[PDB]
Amino acid sequence: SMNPPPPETSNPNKPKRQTNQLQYLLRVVLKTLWKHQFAWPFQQPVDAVKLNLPDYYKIIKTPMDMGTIKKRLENNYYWNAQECIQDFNTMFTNCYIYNKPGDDIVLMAEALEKLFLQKINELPT
Residues that bind ligand XA3 (CB under 6 A): 40-42, 46, 51, 95, 98-99, 105
The smaller minimum CB distance to ligand XA3, of residues 28 and 105, is found at 105
Secondary-structure percent of the chain, ordered helix, strand, coil, rounded to 5: 55, 0, 45
Helix 81-98 and helix 66-74, axial crossing angle in degrees, nearest 10: 170
> Minimum distance between the CB of residue 96 and ligand XA3, rounded to whole angstroms?
9
> Minimum distance between the CB of residue 92 and ligand XA3, rounded to whole angstroms?
9
- Compute the distance between CA of residue 121 and CA of residue 86 in angstroms, rounded to an integer: 14
The smaller minimum CB distance to ligand XA3, of residues 40 and 58, is found at 40
- Measured CA to CA in angstroms, residue 45 lies from 15, 80, 122 at distances of 27, 23, 28
> Minimum distance between the CB of residue 103 and ligand XA3, rounded to whole angstroms?
7
CB 90 within 8 A of CB 62: yes
The smaller minimum CB distance to ligand XA3, of residues 3 and 19, is found at 3
Report the amino acid identity of residue 90. Answer: T
> Minimum distance between the CB of residue 41 and ligand XA3, rounded to whole angstroms?
4
The smaller minimum CB distance to ligand XA3, of residues 22 and 46, is found at 46
